[PDB]
Amino acid sequence: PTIQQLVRKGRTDKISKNKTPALKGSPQRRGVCTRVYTTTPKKPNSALRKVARVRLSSGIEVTAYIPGVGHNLQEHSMVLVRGGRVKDLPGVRYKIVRGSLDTQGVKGRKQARSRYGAKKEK
Amino acid sequence: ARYTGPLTKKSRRLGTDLVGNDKSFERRPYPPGVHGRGRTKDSEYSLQLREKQKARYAYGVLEKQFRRYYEEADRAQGKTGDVLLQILESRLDNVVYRAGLAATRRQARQMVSHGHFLVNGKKVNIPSYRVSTHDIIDVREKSKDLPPIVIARETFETRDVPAWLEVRPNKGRILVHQLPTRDQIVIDVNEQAIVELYSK
Amino acid sequence: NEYLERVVAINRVAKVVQGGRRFSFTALVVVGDGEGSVGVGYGKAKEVPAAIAKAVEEAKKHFFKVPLVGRTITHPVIGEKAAGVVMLRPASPGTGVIAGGSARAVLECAGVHDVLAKSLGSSNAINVVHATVDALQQLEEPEEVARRRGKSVEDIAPAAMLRARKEADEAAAAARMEE
Amino acid sequence: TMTDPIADMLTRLRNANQAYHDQTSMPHSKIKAGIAGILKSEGYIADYKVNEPKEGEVGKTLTLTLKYGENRERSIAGVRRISKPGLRVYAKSTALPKVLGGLGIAIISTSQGLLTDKQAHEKSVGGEVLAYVW
Amino acid sequence: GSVIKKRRKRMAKKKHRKLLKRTRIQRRRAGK
RNA sequence: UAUCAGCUUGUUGGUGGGGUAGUGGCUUACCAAGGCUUUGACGGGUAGCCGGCCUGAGAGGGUGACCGGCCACAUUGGGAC
RNA sequence: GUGCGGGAUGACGGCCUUCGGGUUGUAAACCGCUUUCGCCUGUGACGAAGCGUGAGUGACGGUAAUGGGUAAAGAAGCACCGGCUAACUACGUGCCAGCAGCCGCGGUGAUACGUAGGGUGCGAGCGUUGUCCGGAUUUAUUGGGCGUAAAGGGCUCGUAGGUGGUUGAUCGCGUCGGAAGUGUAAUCUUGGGGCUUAACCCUGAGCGUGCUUUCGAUACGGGUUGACUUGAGGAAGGUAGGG
RNA sequence: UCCUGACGCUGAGGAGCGAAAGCGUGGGGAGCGAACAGGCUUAGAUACCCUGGUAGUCCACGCUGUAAACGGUGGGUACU
RNA sequence: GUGGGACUGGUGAUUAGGACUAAGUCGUAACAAGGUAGCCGUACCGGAAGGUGCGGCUGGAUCA
RNA sequence: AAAAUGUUUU
Ligand SMILES: [Mg+2]
Ligand SMILES: [Mg+2]
Ligand SMILES: [Mg+2]
Ligand SMILES: [Mg+2]
Ligand SMILES: [Mg+2]
Ligand SMILES: [Mg+2]
Ligand SMILES: [Mg+2]
Ligand SMILES: [Mg+2]
Ligand SMILES: [Mg+2]
Ligand SMILES: [Mg+2]
Ligand SMILES: [Mg+2]
Ligand SMILES: [Mg+2]
Ligand SMILES: [Mg+2]
Ligand SMILES: [Mg+2]
Ligand SMILES: [Mg+2]
Ligand SMILES: [Mg+2]
Ligand SMILES: [Mg+2]
Ligand SMILES: [Mg+2]
Ligand SMILES: [Mg+2]
Ligand SMILES: [Mg+2]
Ligand SMILES: [Mg+2]
Ligand SMILES: [Mg+2]
Ligand SMILES: [Mg+2]
Ligand SMILES: [Mg+2]
Ligand SMILES: [Mg+2]
Ligand SMILES: [Mg+2]
Ligand SMILES: [Mg+2]
Ligand SMILES: [Mg+2]
Ligand SMILES: [Mg+2]
Ligand SMILES: [Mg+2]
Ligand SMILES: [Mg+2]
Ligand SMILES: [Mg+2]
Ligand SMILES: [Mg+2]
Ligand SMILES: [Mg+2]
Ligand SMILES: [Mg+2]
Ligand SMILES: [Mg+2]
């Protein structure tokens, strides 16, 4: 565009889409497990991915993935929910922080323990 | 906040003698571990990182402090690699090593941190103390008869003292004629590669 | 060895036939002397070593001189072949080759040791290499600038650049003798 | 209609130099004559001449004769207009532009007449950055 | 142009026009 | 922000009086019909502002913690002493 | 800071194997050293050229600093190892359990899951999440584009606006150059100095990218004013046509 | 040859013009021809093809204001 | 306090289309002359793709 | 001259 066109109407940037609206500017949010279940992934994958409908303290209810082999949380279990997308799962944009509040660390972890909330074993 | 593990493993991984000679570095052509003899690709990052790690494990400096040295050299006028090597050589433990009062830089760090040394009248136990020009490093009077000190006094004649230092071996006194230049630091790394690495 | 070279990129191209696909390998090589002559070669083969060797021997016959004012570019340039735009600027000594992989390989083979190169436009390795190549070919050495303008280097070109050229020539003398 | 006669001069010179023409001609103006003069004094053109009208009998004609070196080699590596009518560019005595790392010349119209950057910097005077001929 | 783009837009437009034709009365009773 | 186009009647100006530390529609009486606006008035949304901070080759982009300057507020609303 | 030098007999044990061995590994064992920090104990401030008529007067505070003693001891974890991306194998599992930032991995030989050995990057931290800038020239003033990739209004007229052929004179608003004032301090850049070094702190200068005042310059932009005809329009004559 | 003497260019918003189909009032209606009816084809044929055939196509005055309204290329100017 | 408006959030029987998923059913509309060249605007018709009329385009072609 | 269609391996 001409300089006069830029003067009359300047450049405008893009919108910069948000990824995790339910957190509302917080690194993680507390919630209650309104439902605990399993979901079949999208193709080409195939499994029984463990997820939970959680009512976060922001008043929004979202689906959160439960990582790691092992699971204890059930109905009305208080959880901490952080960001994180599961690619082969449409509509899952949050994960549950293992080792925090009611959810507990994965039992037999010995590598990458901190990411699954497993205390070091003597 | 100090590497205490084996140094021959690091020398073998980096492909060069980090310190010493006539040792377990007869297994030099391959890094440590089960997968040592395989052929390597060596990307540019790989090469750069190797040069940076060579300098780091040679001088006993961890990553945060090495990075700080890098920004200081980059801000300084002149060649960035020259200034970085000049800083690393101006470190006090390296000064003791180069003067030859220590068998190795690790021994120099040991004695410096233990305080067996005086800097122009004032006691210093900081290995990273940057020695300035015309400085006078002195052995502590109490510790003028350390076993490592007497070994160095027996062996220094074989050792080569750089032109920017004057040493009164038996007296334990390292006079700093001037802050060293690239031609005076021994060429064993690629400071240019390190500088390129710290730009990606 | 005598001539320093980098393999910029290799690609697995295929030709579909009635039976199936006939795969092949393409090789970009940059071969230079490290002092000002450099070239790039494209190689086609069924095998990586054959493609690389063909590219190298094709690059040998495409060596063009690059004007270095003491281990650095003479003056800023912007080259572009097809869609590969590459910007080059000279840098103070000790800056290094601040360039992307392919352009950095081209510059390192050409012998430039202090240069700032940016890759605008497409990121395809071949096109970026050609853009770096014609950016270097656009370089115009100060004596030939003076010949172009019918004047003298002391009348056309910056005193700092000329001086730095003299000190670079002096370190050259140093190395030579030392040998 | 014509908007920037200086840009017209620059593009005429660029096109003629590219097409290897020995001479180019244009309607004359004082600023065009000054730019041609400093181009000649800096060695980018062989010569220039202002001609009294005898074909159109209407106005003076400025004619630039260009120079090509041995083996038909361009003496002009390019010319660019900086201070456009749509957006004008003024440079201070300290922020004077450098062209081709100093090899080329920026033509700056200062309060003391047309002066190449080098000149201006010597006189510590800025002005309107007309061109970047190199 | 691959004509596929025009075909996609054609189908979207035709479906919307069919929706307008089937809901013509309700819109004029209450709405656009 | 135009998917807000009209806004204002002490409003705009004048004269006399009053008031105030002080100029002033600040206030008052009378007279006039102005004032603002597609170069965005009025309305909606958000927000204390800045020295600075982070990032960036720069131009810019984001931001307004500590520290320092100005402003606003002190249970909410109003009022004076 | 968690040690330093020496130490091949390259020990056992793990792990791998082509059962040859390789690897962990100078690592250990073993030998000789050193005592920073921690712990024990002694000495013990500056800040006060203050204050108070004097006597006296430090909250921090037995603090910092420092002498002596102890034992190589009281002191290392976290992430990662398919590509980007530094670093690979075995066992278990068998589109299950699970992984993932993207590409993707897992369907019986998984360097991508889980564990182990080995390794790599960092290290009193290491990862994850959130947010911002960068990379993104991906709003392009620097620094992009619109035949077919996203992008020329269906076409014209025309208002505001933007823009302006040659030249004389003049103004000096833009523009350019000095001077004065201002841009507190801190920050920031940089020169010196102090804390054992550093962070941090003090100090000199720069910066403070502007603004105001004032004195100059007049090439260009613009204002005022006067010319010129080549752009533009008109007259006269000629003239083509499914306007 | 003559005249005026930069009066130029572009133009947001605005206004006008804008194929065909369509709409309103009135007229006209040969041919053509959505819809429609029938015959064929077909697994079906709400199609192609065939026989019929109403709006429309035409006129007057309005309305609508959209097209692959395309050179998918905005206007002006100079040069090569 | 009273009254009439303005703006706006949640919710709503019912209803509309969008996106994704069986490896469901119905045809085959497009891509080759896609078997009636395709597409643009508009109009009417039809379970659905689509069919047809009118004008236009080549981002179609036959035959030169 | 009309003459339709082609699930889910690993
Ligand atoms: Mg291009
Ligand atoms: Mg009054
Ligand atoms: Mg607020
Ligand atoms: Mg702000
Ligand atoms: Mg404050
Ligand atoms: Mg690798
Ligand atoms: Mg297995
Ligand atoms: Mg950007
Ligand atoms: Mg980003
Ligand atoms: Mg683009
Ligand atoms: Mg254009
Ligand atoms: Mg397009
Ligand atoms: Mg058009
Ligand atoms: Mg329109
Ligand atoms: Mg106008
Ligand atoms: Mg003009
Ligand atoms: Mg004049
Ligand atoms: Mg300061
Ligand atoms: Mg100091
Ligand atoms: Mg300041
Ligand atoms: Mg004027
Ligand atoms: Mg006529
Ligand atoms: Mg006249
Ligand atoms: Mg209109
Ligand atoms: Mg019609
Ligand atoms: Mg009709
Ligand atoms: Mg009728
Ligand atoms: Mg029919
Ligand atoms: Mg048309
Ligand atoms: Mg269009
Ligand atoms: Mg237009
Ligand atoms: Mg044009
Ligand atoms: Mg509902
Ligand atoms: Mg079909
Ligand atoms: Mg068809
Ligand atoms: Mg029909």
Automatic annotation (TrEMBL), chain A:
<dbReference type="InterPro" id="IPR006032">
    <property type="entry name" value="Ribosomal_uS12"/>
</dbReference>
<dbReference type="GO" id="GO:0006412">
    <property type="term" value="P:translation"/>
</dbReference>
<comment type="function">
    <text>Interacts with and stabilizes bases of the 16S rRNA that are involved in tRNA selection in the A site and with the mRNA backbone. Located at the interface of the 30S and 50S subunits, it traverses the body of the 30S subunit contacting proteins on the other side and probably holding the rRNA structure together. The combined cluster of proteins S8, S12 and S17 appears to hold together the shoulder and platform of the 30S subunit.</text>
</comment>
<dbReference type="GO" id="GO:0000049">
    <property type="term" value="F:tRNA binding"/>
</dbReference>
<comment type="subunit">
    <text>Part of the 30S ribosomal subunit. Contacts proteins S8 and S17. May interact with IF1 in the 30S initiation complex.</text>
</comment>
<feature type="compositionally biased region" description="Basic residues">
    <location>
        <begin position="107"/>
        <end position="122"/>
    </location>
</feature>
<keyword id="KW-0689">Ribosomal protein</keyword>
<dbReference type="GO" id="GO:0019843">
    <property type="term" value="F:rRNA binding"/>
</dbReference>
<dbReference type="InterPro" id="IPR005679">
    <property type="entry name" value="Ribosomal_uS12_bac"/>
</dbReference>
<dbReference type="GO" id="GO:0015935">
    <property type="term" value="C:small ribosomal subunit"/>
</dbReference>
<comment type="function">
    <text>With S4 and S5 plays an important role in translational accuracy.</text>
</comment>
<keyword id="KW-0820">tRNA-binding</keyword>
TrEMBL record, chain B:
<dbReference type="GO" id="GO:0003735">
    <property type="term" value="F:structural constituent of ribosome"/>
</dbReference>
<comment type="function">
    <text>One of the primary rRNA binding proteins, it binds directly to 16S rRNA where it nucleates assembly of the body of the 30S subunit.</text>
</comment>
<keyword id="KW-0687">Ribonucleoprotein</keyword>
<protein>
    <recommendedName>
        <fullName>Small ribosomal subunit protein uS4</fullName>
    </recommendedName>
</protein>
<dbReference type="InterPro" id="IPR005709">
    <property type="entry name" value="Ribosomal_uS4_bac-type"/>
</dbReference>
<comment type="similarity">
    <text>Belongs to the universal ribosomal protein uS4 family.</text>
</comment>
<feature type="domain" description="RNA-binding S4">
    <location>
        <begin position="90"/>
        <end position="147"/>
    </location>
</feature>
<dbReference type="InterPro" id="IPR001912">
    <property type="entry name" value="Ribosomal_uS4_N"/>
</dbReference>
<dbReference type="Pfam" id="PF01479">
    <property type="entry name" value="S4"/>
</dbReference>
<dbReference type="InterPro" id="IPR022801">
    <property type="entry name" value="Ribosomal_uS4"/>
</dbReference>
<keyword id="KW-0689">Ribosomal protein</keyword>
<dbReference type="Pfam" id="PF00163">
    <property type="entry name" value="Ribosomal_S4"/>
</dbReference>
From TrEMBL, chain C:
<comment type="function">
    <text>With S4 and S12 plays an important role in translational accuracy.</text>
</comment>
<dbReference type="GO" id="GO:0006412">
    <property type="term" value="P:translation"/>
</dbReference>
<protein>
    <recommendedName>
        <fullName>Small ribosomal subunit protein uS5</fullName>
    </recommendedName>
</protein>
<comment type="function">
    <text>Located at the back of the 30S subunit body where it stabilizes the conformation of the head with respect to the body.</text>
</comment>
<keyword id="KW-0699">rRNA-binding</keyword>
<keyword id="KW-0694">RNA-binding</keyword>
<comment type="similarity">
    <text>Belongs to the universal ribosomal protein uS5 family.</text>
</comment>
<dbReference type="GO" id="GO:0003735">
    <property type="term" value="F:structural constituent of ribosome"/>
</dbReference>
<feature type="domain" description="S5 DRBM">
    <location>
        <begin position="3"/>
        <end position="66"/>
    </location>
</feature>
<keyword id="KW-0687">Ribonucleoprotein</keyword>
<dbReference type="GO" id="GO:0005737">
    <property type="term" value="C:cytoplasm"/>
</dbReference>
<dbReference type="GO" id="GO:0042254">
    <property type="term" value="P:ribosome biogenesis"/>
</dbReference>
UniProtKB/TrEMBL annotation, chain D:
<dbReference type="GO" id="GO:0019843">
    <property type="term" value="F:rRNA binding"/>
</dbReference>
<dbReference type="InterPro" id="IPR047863">
    <property type="entry name" value="Ribosomal_uS8_CS"/>
</dbReference>
<dbReference type="GO" id="GO:1990904">
    <property type="term" value="C:ribonucleoprotein complex"/>
</dbReference>
<keyword id="KW-0687">Ribonucleoprotein</keyword>
<dbReference type="GO" id="GO:0005737">
    <property type="term" value="C:cytoplasm"/>
</dbReference>
<comment type="subunit">
    <text>Part of the 30S ribosomal subunit. Contacts proteins S5 and S12.</text>
</comment>
<dbReference type="GO" id="GO:0003735">
    <property type="term" value="F:structural constituent of ribosome"/>
</dbReference>
<keyword id="KW-0694">RNA-binding</keyword>
<comment type="function">
    <text>One of the primary rRNA binding proteins, it binds directly to 16S rRNA central domain where it helps coordinate assembly of the platform of the 30S subunit.</text>
</comment>
<keyword id="KW-0689">Ribosomal protein</keyword>
<dbReference type="GO" id="GO:0006412">
    <property type="term" value="P:translation"/>
</dbReference>
<protein>
    <recommendedName>
        <fullName>Small ribosomal subunit protein uS8</fullName>
    </recommendedName>
</protein>
